Design a binder for this molecule. Structure first.
Ligand code: EIC
Ligand code: EIC
Ligand code: K
Ligand code: K
Lengths: 262, 263
Protein backbone atom coordinates (compact mmCIF):
# COMPACT_ATOMS: atom_id res chain seq x y z
CA UNK A 1 0.00 0.00 0.00
CA UNK A 2 2.17 2.82 1.40
CA UNK A 3 2.26 6.17 -0.42
CA UNK A 4 2.30 4.01 -3.52
CA UNK A 5 -1.28 2.75 -3.78
CA UNK A 6 -2.60 6.31 -3.73
CA UNK A 7 -3.26 5.72 -7.44
CA UNK A 8 -6.61 4.19 -6.45
CA UNK A 9 -7.79 7.48 -4.97
CA UNK A 10 -6.12 9.26 -7.89
CA UNK A 11 -8.09 7.34 -10.53
CA UNK A 12 -11.29 7.69 -8.50
CA UNK A 13 -10.51 11.42 -8.27
CA UNK A 14 -10.12 11.97 -12.01
CA UNK A 15 -13.28 9.87 -12.45
CA UNK A 16 -15.28 12.08 -10.09
CA UNK A 17 -13.82 15.28 -11.53
CA UNK A 18 -14.67 14.17 -15.06
CA UNK A 19 -18.21 13.36 -13.95
CA UNK A 20 -18.84 16.72 -12.28
CA UNK A 21 -17.20 18.55 -15.19
CA UNK A 22 -19.53 16.78 -17.62
CA UNK A 23 -22.69 17.38 -15.57
CA UNK A 24 -21.90 21.04 -15.00
CA UNK A 25 -21.89 22.29 -18.63
CA UNK A 26 -22.65 19.60 -21.21
CA UNK A 27 -25.59 21.96 -21.78
CA UNK A 28 -23.19 24.74 -22.81
CA UNK A 29 -21.38 22.40 -25.17
CA UNK A 30 -24.58 21.13 -26.82
CA UNK A 31 -25.79 24.71 -27.24
CA UNK A 32 -22.48 25.78 -28.79
CA UNK A 33 -22.47 22.89 -31.27
CA UNK A 34 -26.14 23.39 -32.19
CA UNK A 35 -25.79 27.14 -32.78
CA UNK A 36 -22.53 26.61 -34.70
CA UNK A 37 -24.19 24.10 -37.05
CA UNK A 38 -27.14 26.46 -37.39
CA UNK A 39 -25.02 29.32 -38.65
CA UNK A 40 -23.18 26.82 -40.83
CA UNK A 41 -26.47 26.18 -42.58
CA UNK A 42 -27.17 29.92 -42.64
CA UNK A 43 -23.78 30.90 -44.09
CA UNK A 44 -23.86 28.17 -46.74
CA UNK A 45 -27.39 29.30 -47.63
CA UNK A 46 -26.69 33.03 -47.90
CA UNK A 47 -23.61 32.56 -50.07
CA UNK A 48 -24.61 29.54 -52.19
CA UNK A 49 -21.51 27.69 -51.03
CA UNK A 50 -21.28 23.91 -50.98
CA UNK A 51 -20.24 21.66 -48.09
CA UNK A 52 -17.10 20.21 -49.70
CA UNK A 53 -15.79 23.71 -50.40
CA UNK A 54 -16.20 24.54 -46.71
CA UNK A 55 -14.62 21.17 -45.86
CA UNK A 56 -11.44 21.94 -47.77
CA UNK A 57 -11.30 25.64 -46.92
CA UNK A 58 -11.72 25.11 -43.17
CA UNK A 59 -9.34 22.13 -43.09
CA UNK A 60 -6.54 24.02 -44.77
CA UNK A 61 -7.32 27.22 -42.89
CA UNK A 62 -6.69 25.10 -39.79
CA UNK A 63 -3.43 24.02 -41.42
CA UNK A 64 -2.42 27.66 -41.91
CA UNK A 65 -3.46 28.56 -38.34
CA UNK A 66 -1.23 25.70 -37.25
CA UNK A 67 1.37 27.70 -39.17
CA UNK A 68 0.36 30.64 -36.97
CA UNK A 69 -2.15 33.05 -38.52
CA UNK A 70 -4.26 34.02 -35.46
CA UNK A 71 -7.19 35.70 -37.16
CA UNK A 72 -6.86 39.10 -35.49
CA UNK A 73 -3.93 41.32 -36.43
CA UNK A 74 -1.18 39.69 -34.39
CA UNK A 75 2.59 39.95 -34.12
CA UNK A 76 4.69 37.97 -36.57
CA UNK A 77 4.29 34.68 -34.68
CA UNK A 78 8.02 34.19 -34.68
CA UNK A 79 10.93 36.64 -34.97
CA UNK A 80 13.79 37.61 -32.67
CA UNK A 81 11.08 38.55 -30.17
CA UNK A 82 8.79 35.85 -31.56
CA UNK A 83 11.34 33.06 -31.26
CA UNK A 84 12.28 34.48 -27.86
CA UNK A 85 8.68 34.10 -26.67
CA UNK A 86 8.41 30.67 -28.31
CA UNK A 87 11.53 29.40 -26.54
CA UNK A 88 10.45 30.99 -23.25
CA UNK A 89 7.25 28.99 -23.56
CA UNK A 90 9.31 25.89 -24.37
CA UNK A 91 11.92 25.94 -21.61
CA UNK A 92 9.35 26.71 -18.91
CA UNK A 93 7.29 23.76 -20.25
CA UNK A 94 4.18 25.95 -20.53
CA UNK A 95 3.49 24.81 -24.09
CA UNK A 96 1.02 27.49 -25.16
CA UNK A 97 0.95 26.03 -28.67
CA UNK A 98 0.65 29.40 -30.41
CA UNK A 99 4.06 28.80 -32.05
CA UNK A 100 5.17 25.36 -33.23
CA UNK A 101 8.00 24.35 -35.58
CA UNK A 102 7.12 23.28 -39.11
CA UNK A 103 10.33 21.86 -40.63
CA UNK A 104 11.75 18.49 -39.64
CA UNK A 105 15.06 20.20 -38.92
CA UNK A 106 13.24 22.59 -36.61
CA UNK A 107 11.46 19.61 -35.05
CA UNK A 108 14.64 17.68 -34.26
CA UNK A 109 16.39 20.85 -33.09
CA UNK A 110 13.44 21.34 -30.75
CA UNK A 111 13.95 17.77 -29.52
CA UNK A 112 17.55 18.50 -28.53
CA UNK A 113 16.61 21.98 -27.31
CA UNK A 114 13.92 20.75 -24.94
CA UNK A 115 15.99 17.78 -23.78
CA UNK A 116 18.93 20.03 -22.87
CA UNK A 117 17.07 23.12 -21.64
CA UNK A 118 13.76 22.20 -19.98
CA UNK A 119 15.45 20.43 -17.02
CA UNK A 120 17.70 23.49 -16.71
CA UNK A 121 14.67 25.73 -16.14
CA UNK A 122 13.00 23.24 -13.82
CA UNK A 123 16.20 23.24 -11.77
CA UNK A 124 16.30 27.04 -11.98
CA UNK A 125 12.81 27.04 -10.46
CA UNK A 126 14.23 24.77 -7.75
CA UNK A 127 17.02 27.31 -7.22
CA UNK A 128 14.40 30.06 -6.95
CA UNK A 129 12.66 27.94 -4.31
CA UNK A 130 15.94 27.69 -2.39
CA UNK A 131 16.49 31.44 -2.63
CA UNK A 132 12.94 32.23 -1.53
CA UNK A 133 13.15 29.92 1.48
CA UNK A 134 16.54 31.29 2.54
CA UNK A 135 15.58 34.95 2.07
CA UNK A 136 12.23 34.53 3.83
CA UNK A 137 13.96 32.85 6.77
CA UNK A 138 16.40 35.77 6.86
CA UNK A 139 13.58 38.33 6.88
CA UNK A 140 11.82 36.34 9.61
CA UNK A 141 14.98 36.52 11.72
CA UNK A 142 15.08 40.24 10.93
CA UNK A 143 11.47 40.79 12.03
CA UNK A 144 12.04 38.77 15.21
CA UNK A 145 15.17 40.78 16.01
CA UNK A 146 13.27 44.02 15.35
CA UNK A 147 10.37 43.10 17.63
CA UNK A 148 12.81 41.99 20.34
CA UNK A 149 15.02 45.11 20.27
CA UNK A 150 12.43 47.74 19.32
CA UNK A 151 18.18 26.52 7.34
CA UNK A 152 18.36 28.97 10.23
CA UNK A 153 14.79 29.49 11.39
CA UNK A 154 13.57 27.05 8.70
CA UNK A 155 9.96 28.27 8.41
CA UNK A 156 7.44 25.47 8.71
CA UNK A 157 5.82 24.02 5.60
CA UNK A 158 2.44 25.35 6.76
CA UNK A 159 3.51 29.00 7.05
CA UNK A 160 5.69 28.77 3.93
CA UNK A 161 2.66 27.37 2.11
CA UNK A 162 0.35 30.11 3.40
CA UNK A 163 2.62 33.03 2.49
CA UNK A 164 3.43 31.31 -0.82
CA UNK A 165 -0.20 31.13 -1.91
CA UNK A 166 -0.54 34.70 -0.62
CA UNK A 167 2.26 35.83 -2.93
CA UNK A 168 0.66 33.80 -5.72
CA UNK A 169 -2.76 35.44 -5.41
CA UNK A 170 -1.17 38.88 -4.99
CA UNK A 171 0.92 38.57 -8.16
CA UNK A 172 -2.22 37.21 -9.82
CA UNK A 173 -4.07 40.44 -8.99
CA UNK A 174 -1.18 42.57 -10.26
CA UNK A 175 -0.90 40.57 -13.49
CA UNK A 176 -4.66 40.75 -14.00
CA UNK A 177 -4.74 44.51 -13.36
CA UNK A 178 -2.00 44.91 -15.97
CA UNK A 179 -3.53 42.53 -18.55
CA UNK A 180 -7.20 43.56 -18.39
CA UNK A 181 -6.78 47.15 -19.72
CA UNK A 182 -4.49 45.79 -22.46
CA UNK A 183 -5.82 42.39 -23.51
CA UNK A 184 -9.42 43.45 -22.88
CA UNK A 185 -10.33 40.28 -20.97
CA UNK A 186 -12.35 40.03 -17.76
CA UNK A 187 -10.95 39.91 -14.24
CA UNK A 188 -11.94 36.27 -13.71
CA UNK A 189 -10.79 35.44 -17.25
CA UNK A 190 -7.42 37.05 -16.53
CA UNK A 191 -7.19 35.15 -13.22
CA UNK A 192 -7.88 31.91 -15.09
CA UNK A 193 -5.23 32.73 -17.70
CA UNK A 194 -2.72 33.57 -14.95
CA UNK A 195 -3.39 30.26 -13.22
CA UNK A 196 -3.10 28.34 -16.50
CA UNK A 197 0.18 30.01 -17.51
CA UNK A 198 1.78 29.92 -14.06
CA UNK A 199 0.81 26.28 -13.41
CA UNK A 200 2.83 25.09 -16.45
CA UNK A 201 -0.41 23.87 -18.07
CA UNK A 202 -0.55 26.43 -20.87
CA UNK A 203 -3.83 25.60 -22.59
CA UNK A 204 -3.43 28.30 -25.24
CA UNK A 205 -7.11 29.25 -25.35
CA UNK A 206 -6.12 32.50 -23.62
CA UNK A 207 -2.57 33.60 -24.42
CA UNK A 208 -0.53 36.63 -23.39
CA UNK A 209 0.65 39.54 -25.56
CA UNK A 210 0.25 38.48 -29.20
CA UNK A 211 -1.16 41.53 -31.04
CA UNK A 212 1.03 43.30 -33.57
CA UNK A 213 0.77 46.68 -31.81
CA UNK A 214 0.92 47.51 -28.11
CA UNK A 215 1.44 50.79 -26.30
CA UNK A 216 5.08 50.86 -25.15
CA UNK A 217 5.76 47.57 -26.89
CA UNK A 218 9.21 46.95 -25.42
CA UNK A 219 8.27 47.92 -21.87
CA UNK A 220 5.04 45.91 -22.05
CA UNK A 221 6.89 42.87 -23.41
CA UNK A 222 9.48 43.08 -20.63
CA UNK A 223 6.75 43.44 -18.00
CA UNK A 224 4.87 40.44 -19.42
CA UNK A 225 8.05 38.35 -19.44
CA UNK A 226 9.01 39.18 -15.86
CA UNK A 227 5.43 38.72 -14.62
CA UNK A 228 5.12 35.31 -16.30
CA UNK A 229 8.50 34.23 -14.92
CA UNK A 230 7.70 35.30 -11.36
CA UNK A 231 4.22 33.78 -11.49
CA UNK A 232 5.37 30.41 -12.81
CA UNK A 233 8.19 30.35 -10.25
CA UNK A 234 5.85 31.09 -7.34
CA UNK A 235 3.22 28.61 -8.53
CA UNK A 236 5.77 25.83 -9.01
CA UNK A 237 7.09 26.55 -5.51
CA UNK A 238 3.55 26.34 -4.12
CA UNK A 239 2.95 23.12 -6.05
CA UNK A 240 6.01 21.43 -4.55
CA UNK A 241 5.27 22.73 -1.04
CA UNK A 242 1.69 21.49 -1.00
CA UNK A 243 2.92 18.27 -2.61
CA UNK A 244 5.04 17.54 0.44
CA UNK A 245 2.21 18.78 2.70
CA UNK A 246 -0.38 16.43 1.18
CA UNK A 247 2.07 13.53 1.25
CA UNK A 248 2.51 14.18 4.97
CA UNK A 249 -1.27 14.20 5.33
CA UNK A 250 -1.62 11.04 3.23
CA UNK A 251 0.96 9.23 5.36
CA UNK A 252 -0.97 10.34 8.45
CA UNK A 253 -4.33 9.11 7.14
CA UNK A 254 -2.81 5.84 5.93
CA UNK A 255 -1.27 5.27 9.37
CA UNK A 256 -4.69 5.88 10.92
CA UNK A 257 -6.32 3.46 8.47
CA UNK A 258 -3.71 0.77 9.15
CA UNK A 259 -3.98 1.21 12.93
CA UNK A 260 -7.79 1.22 13.05
CA UNK A 261 -8.52 -1.26 10.27
CA UNK A 262 -5.70 -3.61 11.22
CA UNK B 1 27.46 34.32 -8.32
CA UNK B 2 27.09 30.68 -7.19
CA UNK B 3 24.52 28.47 -8.92
CA UNK B 4 22.36 31.56 -8.80
CA UNK B 5 23.85 33.79 -11.51
CA UNK B 6 23.41 31.04 -14.09
CA UNK B 7 20.55 33.22 -15.37
CA UNK B 8 23.12 35.11 -17.45
CA UNK B 9 23.97 31.99 -19.45
CA UNK B 10 20.26 31.12 -19.43
CA UNK B 11 19.21 34.41 -21.06
CA UNK B 12 22.12 34.21 -23.50
CA UNK B 13 20.99 30.64 -24.25
CA UNK B 14 17.39 31.54 -25.08
CA UNK B 15 18.79 34.45 -27.12
CA UNK B 16 21.01 32.15 -29.18
CA UNK B 17 18.31 29.51 -29.54
CA UNK B 18 15.82 32.13 -30.73
CA UNK B 19 18.37 33.40 -33.25
CA UNK B 20 19.15 29.98 -34.73
CA UNK B 21 15.45 29.08 -34.76
CA UNK B 22 14.69 32.25 -36.71
CA UNK B 23 17.53 31.81 -39.21
CA UNK B 24 16.71 28.17 -39.85
CA UNK B 25 13.16 28.52 -41.26
CA UNK B 26 11.93 32.11 -41.50
CA UNK B 27 11.89 31.11 -45.18
CA UNK B 28 9.29 28.41 -44.44
CA UNK B 29 7.17 30.88 -42.51
CA UNK B 30 7.29 33.55 -45.22
CA UNK B 31 6.39 30.95 -47.84
CA UNK B 32 3.46 29.69 -45.75
CA UNK B 33 2.07 33.19 -45.21
CA UNK B 34 2.51 34.16 -48.87
CA UNK B 35 0.81 31.03 -50.22
CA UNK B 36 -1.97 31.33 -47.62
CA UNK B 37 -2.71 34.92 -48.67
CA UNK B 38 -2.55 33.84 -52.30
CA UNK B 39 -5.26 31.23 -51.90
CA UNK B 40 -7.19 33.76 -49.83
CA UNK B 41 -7.30 35.96 -52.91
CA UNK B 42 -8.12 32.92 -55.05
CA UNK B 43 -10.97 31.67 -52.82
CA UNK B 44 -12.51 35.13 -52.47
CA UNK B 45 -12.27 35.50 -56.25
CA UNK B 46 -13.81 32.17 -57.21
CA UNK B 47 -16.77 32.55 -54.85
CA UNK B 48 -17.41 36.32 -55.05
CA UNK B 49 -17.06 36.58 -51.29
CA UNK B 50 -16.05 39.80 -49.55
CA UNK B 51 -13.27 40.32 -47.00
CA UNK B 52 -15.49 41.33 -44.06
CA UNK B 53 -17.58 38.18 -44.49
CA UNK B 54 -14.39 36.11 -44.26
CA UNK B 55 -13.30 38.26 -41.30
CA UNK B 56 -16.41 37.45 -39.29
CA UNK B 57 -16.75 33.84 -40.44
CA UNK B 58 -13.14 32.93 -39.65
CA UNK B 59 -13.14 34.82 -36.34
CA UNK B 60 -16.21 33.04 -35.05
CA UNK B 61 -15.15 29.72 -36.55
CA UNK B 62 -12.07 30.16 -34.37
CA UNK B 63 -14.45 30.82 -31.47
CA UNK B 64 -16.27 27.55 -32.18
CA UNK B 65 -12.98 25.65 -32.55
CA UNK B 66 -12.07 27.07 -29.16
CA UNK B 67 -15.31 25.35 -28.17
CA UNK B 68 -13.80 22.20 -29.68
CA UNK B 69 -14.88 21.42 -33.25
CA UNK B 70 -11.65 19.97 -34.71
CA UNK B 71 -12.50 20.01 -38.41
CA UNK B 72 -12.10 16.28 -39.06
CA UNK B 73 -14.67 13.89 -37.61
CA UNK B 74 -13.45 13.72 -34.02
CA UNK B 75 -14.73 12.31 -30.74
CA UNK B 76 -17.13 14.41 -28.71
CA UNK B 77 -14.40 16.65 -27.27
CA UNK B 78 -15.68 16.01 -23.79
CA UNK B 79 -17.73 13.16 -22.28
CA UNK B 80 -17.05 10.58 -19.58
CA UNK B 81 -14.08 9.55 -21.70
CA UNK B 82 -13.69 13.10 -22.99
CA UNK B 83 -13.62 14.69 -19.54
CA UNK B 84 -11.37 11.83 -18.44
CA UNK B 85 -8.84 12.72 -21.15
CA UNK B 86 -9.23 16.44 -20.42
CA UNK B 87 -8.51 15.95 -16.72
CA UNK B 88 -5.64 13.57 -17.47
CA UNK B 89 -4.14 16.34 -19.57
CA UNK B 90 -4.77 18.79 -16.71
CA UNK B 91 -3.35 16.90 -13.73
CA UNK B 92 -0.20 15.88 -15.63
CA UNK B 93 0.23 19.58 -16.59
CA UNK B 94 0.55 18.66 -20.28
CA UNK B 95 -2.01 21.27 -21.33
CA UNK B 96 -2.76 20.06 -24.85
CA UNK B 97 -5.42 22.75 -25.21
CA UNK B 98 -7.78 20.59 -27.27
CA UNK B 99 -10.36 20.79 -24.44
CA UNK B 100 -10.86 23.95 -22.38
CA UNK B 101 -13.74 24.96 -20.08
CA UNK B 102 -16.22 27.54 -21.31
CA UNK B 103 -18.39 28.47 -18.30
CA UNK B 104 -17.11 30.62 -15.44
CA UNK B 105 -18.21 27.90 -13.04
CA UNK B 106 -16.14 25.42 -15.02
CA UNK B 107 -13.26 27.90 -14.98
CA UNK B 108 -13.24 28.36 -11.22
CA UNK B 109 -13.76 24.63 -10.65
CA UNK B 110 -10.70 24.11 -12.86
CA UNK B 111 -8.82 26.59 -10.66
CA UNK B 112 -9.52 24.54 -7.53
CA UNK B 113 -9.05 21.28 -9.46
CA UNK B 114 -5.60 22.19 -10.73
CA UNK B 115 -4.54 23.72 -7.42
CA UNK B 116 -5.48 20.56 -5.50
CA UNK B 117 -4.54 17.91 -8.07
CA UNK B 118 -1.57 18.99 -10.19
CA UNK B 119 0.89 18.87 -7.25
CA UNK B 120 -0.54 15.44 -6.43
CA UNK B 121 0.48 14.12 -9.85
CA UNK B 122 3.87 15.84 -9.73
CA UNK B 123 4.46 14.12 -6.39
CA UNK B 124 3.18 10.86 -7.89
CA UNK B 125 5.84 11.25 -10.58
CA UNK B 126 8.32 11.75 -7.73
CA UNK B 127 7.02 8.53 -6.16
CA UNK B 128 7.49 6.77 -9.50
CA UNK B 129 11.07 8.06 -9.52
CA UNK B 130 11.59 6.58 -6.05
CA UNK B 131 10.12 3.25 -7.13
CA UNK B 132 12.22 3.13 -10.29
CA UNK B 133 15.45 3.89 -8.42
CA UNK B 134 14.71 1.31 -5.71
CA UNK B 135 13.64 -1.42 -8.15
CA UNK B 136 16.58 -0.80 -10.48
CA UNK B 137 18.99 -1.00 -7.54
CA UNK B 138 17.33 -4.28 -6.55
CA UNK B 139 17.71 -5.72 -10.05
CA UNK B 140 21.34 -4.56 -10.12
CA UNK B 141 21.95 -6.45 -6.87
CA UNK B 142 20.18 -9.42 -8.48
CA UNK B 143 22.37 -9.31 -11.60
CA UNK B 144 25.52 -8.98 -9.49
CA UNK B 145 24.48 -11.94 -7.34
CA UNK B 146 23.71 -13.96 -10.48
CA UNK B 147 27.08 -13.24 -12.08
CA UNK B 148 28.85 -14.04 -8.80
CA UNK B 149 27.09 -17.37 -8.13
CA UNK B 150 26.50 -18.54 -11.71
CA UNK B 151 19.65 3.10 -1.13
CA UNK B 152 21.45 -0.24 -1.24
CA UNK B 153 23.68 -0.15 -4.30
CA UNK B 154 22.45 3.41 -5.06
CA UNK B 155 23.23 3.48 -8.80
CA UNK B 156 25.23 6.52 -9.82
CA UNK B 157 23.51 9.49 -11.44
CA UNK B 158 25.44 8.83 -14.66
CA UNK B 159 24.28 5.22 -15.12
CA UNK B 160 20.77 6.04 -13.90
CA UNK B 161 20.71 8.85 -16.46
CA UNK B 162 21.95 6.60 -19.27
CA UNK B 163 19.48 3.78 -18.68
CA UNK B 164 16.73 6.36 -18.10
CA UNK B 165 17.20 7.99 -21.50
CA UNK B 166 17.48 4.46 -22.92
CA UNK B 167 14.05 3.59 -21.50
CA UNK B 168 12.77 6.93 -22.79
CA UNK B 169 13.88 6.35 -26.38
CA UNK B 170 12.69 2.73 -26.25
CA UNK B 171 9.19 3.66 -25.10
CA UNK B 172 9.30 6.40 -27.73
CA UNK B 173 9.84 3.79 -30.45
CA UNK B 174 7.03 1.60 -29.08
CA UNK B 175 4.62 4.55 -28.85
CA UNK B 176 5.56 5.67 -32.36
CA UNK B 177 5.11 2.17 -33.78
CA UNK B 178 1.66 2.07 -32.19
CA UNK B 179 0.62 5.61 -33.23
CA UNK B 180 1.87 5.69 -36.83
CA UNK B 181 -0.46 2.97 -38.25
CA UNK B 182 -3.37 4.59 -36.37
CA UNK B 183 -2.85 8.36 -36.45
CA UNK B 184 -1.22 8.20 -39.87
CA UNK B 185 1.70 10.46 -38.92
CA UNK B 186 5.37 9.98 -39.78
CA UNK B 187 7.98 8.29 -37.62
CA UNK B 188 9.82 11.54 -36.88
CA UNK B 189 6.50 13.34 -36.44
CA UNK B 190 5.41 10.69 -33.93
CA UNK B 191 8.76 10.96 -32.13
CA UNK B 192 8.28 14.73 -31.91
CA UNK B 193 4.74 14.30 -30.57
CA UNK B 194 5.98 11.76 -28.01
CA UNK B 195 8.68 14.15 -26.82
CA UNK B 196 6.21 17.04 -26.62
CA UNK B 197 3.61 15.06 -24.67
CA UNK B 198 6.07 13.31 -22.35
CA UNK B 199 8.02 16.50 -21.57
CA UNK B 200 4.90 18.17 -20.09
CA UNK B 201 5.04 20.81 -22.86
CA UNK B 202 1.91 19.72 -24.72
CA UNK B 203 1.88 22.07 -27.71
CA UNK B 204 -1.37 20.66 -29.10
CA UNK B 205 -0.32 20.92 -32.76
CA UNK B 206 -0.08 17.11 -32.75
CA UNK B 207 -2.44 15.46 -30.27
CA UNK B 208 -3.15 11.82 -29.43
CA UNK B 209 -6.32 9.82 -30.12
CA UNK B 210 -9.09 12.30 -30.97
CA UNK B 211 -11.01 10.78 -33.90
CA UNK B 212 -14.57 9.61 -33.32
CA UNK B 213 -13.87 6.04 -34.46
CA UNK B 214 -10.89 3.80 -33.73
CA UNK B 215 -10.40 0.07 -34.14
CA UNK B 216 -10.79 -1.48 -30.68
CA UNK B 217 -11.67 1.89 -29.19
CA UNK B 218 -11.52 0.86 -25.53
CA UNK B 219 -8.29 -1.13 -25.86
CA UNK B 220 -6.66 1.61 -27.93
CA UNK B 221 -7.73 4.28 -25.43
CA UNK B 222 -6.32 2.25 -22.53
CA UNK B 223 -3.06 1.67 -24.42
CA UNK B 224 -2.76 5.38 -25.22
CA UNK B 225 -3.42 6.31 -21.58
CA UNK B 226 -0.85 3.89 -20.17
CA UNK B 227 1.73 4.82 -22.82
CA UNK B 228 1.32 8.55 -22.14
CA UNK B 229 1.55 7.98 -18.39
CA UNK B 230 4.70 5.85 -18.62
CA UNK B 231 6.33 8.23 -21.10
CA UNK B 232 5.67 11.36 -19.07
CA UNK B 233 6.87 9.60 -15.92
CA UNK B 234 10.12 8.46 -17.54
CA UNK B 235 10.76 11.84 -19.16
CA UNK B 236 10.14 13.73 -15.91
CA UNK B 237 12.53 11.34 -14.16
CA UNK B 238 15.15 11.97 -16.84
CA UNK B 239 14.58 15.72 -16.56
CA UNK B 240 15.20 15.73 -12.80
CA UNK B 241 18.22 13.41 -13.10
CA UNK B 242 19.97 15.49 -15.74
CA UNK B 243 18.97 18.60 -13.76
CA UNK B 244 21.06 17.41 -10.83
CA UNK B 245 23.78 16.24 -13.25
CA UNK B 246 24.08 19.63 -14.97
CA UNK B 247 24.01 21.44 -11.62
CA UNK B 248 26.95 19.26 -10.56
CA UNK B 249 28.70 20.18 -13.81
CA UNK B 250 27.86 23.87 -13.37
CA UNK B 251 29.26 23.87 -9.83
CA UNK B 252 32.40 22.21 -11.20
CA UNK B 253 32.88 24.77 -13.99
CA UNK B 254 32.14 27.67 -11.64
CA UNK B 255 34.74 26.36 -9.19
CA UNK B 256 37.25 26.18 -12.05
CA UNK B 257 36.38 29.73 -13.13
CA UNK B 258 36.73 31.07 -9.59
CA UNK B 259 40.04 29.26 -9.04
CA UNK B 260 41.60 30.28 -12.37
CA UNK B 261 40.11 33.76 -12.72
CA UNK B 262 40.53 34.62 -9.05
CA UNK B 263 39.12 38.10 -9.13
C1 EIC C 1 2.31 -9.90 -4.97
C2 EIC C 1 2.43 -9.17 -3.64
C3 EIC C 1 2.00 -7.71 -3.74
C4 EIC C 1 3.10 -6.74 -3.33
C5 EIC C 1 2.71 -5.28 -3.56
C6 EIC C 1 3.09 -4.78 -4.95
C7 EIC C 1 1.88 -4.64 -5.86
C8 EIC C 1 2.26 -4.12 -7.25
C9 EIC C 1 1.34 -3.00 -7.72
C10 EIC C 1 2.06 -1.65 -7.77
C11 EIC C 1 1.08 -0.48 -7.76
C12 EIC C 1 0.34 -0.32 -9.08
C13 EIC C 1 0.60 1.04 -9.73
C14 EIC C 1 0.42 1.01 -11.24
O1 EIC C 1 0.37 -0.09 -11.85
O2 EIC C 1 0.32 2.09 -11.88
C1 EIC D 1 25.10 44.22 -3.74
C2 EIC D 1 26.02 43.01 -3.59
C3 EIC D 1 25.68 41.90 -4.59
C4 EIC D 1 25.34 40.58 -3.89
C5 EIC D 1 24.89 39.51 -4.88
C6 EIC D 1 23.37 39.53 -5.09
C7 EIC D 1 22.99 40.10 -6.45
C8 EIC D 1 21.48 40.11 -6.67
C9 EIC D 1 21.10 39.57 -8.05
C10 EIC D 1 20.39 38.22 -7.96
C11 EIC D 1 20.44 37.46 -9.28
C12 EIC D 1 19.51 38.06 -10.34
C13 EIC D 1 18.46 37.06 -10.80
C14 EIC D 1 17.20 37.75 -11.34
O1 EIC D 1 17.00 38.97 -11.10
O2 EIC D 1 16.37 37.10 -12.02
K1 K E 1 3.77 21.68 -18.41
K1 K F 1 2.22 22.37 -20.60
Amino acid sequence: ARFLLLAALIVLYLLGGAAVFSALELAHERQAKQRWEERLANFSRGHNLSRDELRGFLRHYEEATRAGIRVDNVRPRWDFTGAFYFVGTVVSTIGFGMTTPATVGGKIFLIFYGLVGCPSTILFFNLFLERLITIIAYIMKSCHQRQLRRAGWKPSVYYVMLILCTASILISCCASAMYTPIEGWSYFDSLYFCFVAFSTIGFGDLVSSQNAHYESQGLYRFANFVFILMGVCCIYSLFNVISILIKQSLNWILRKMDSGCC
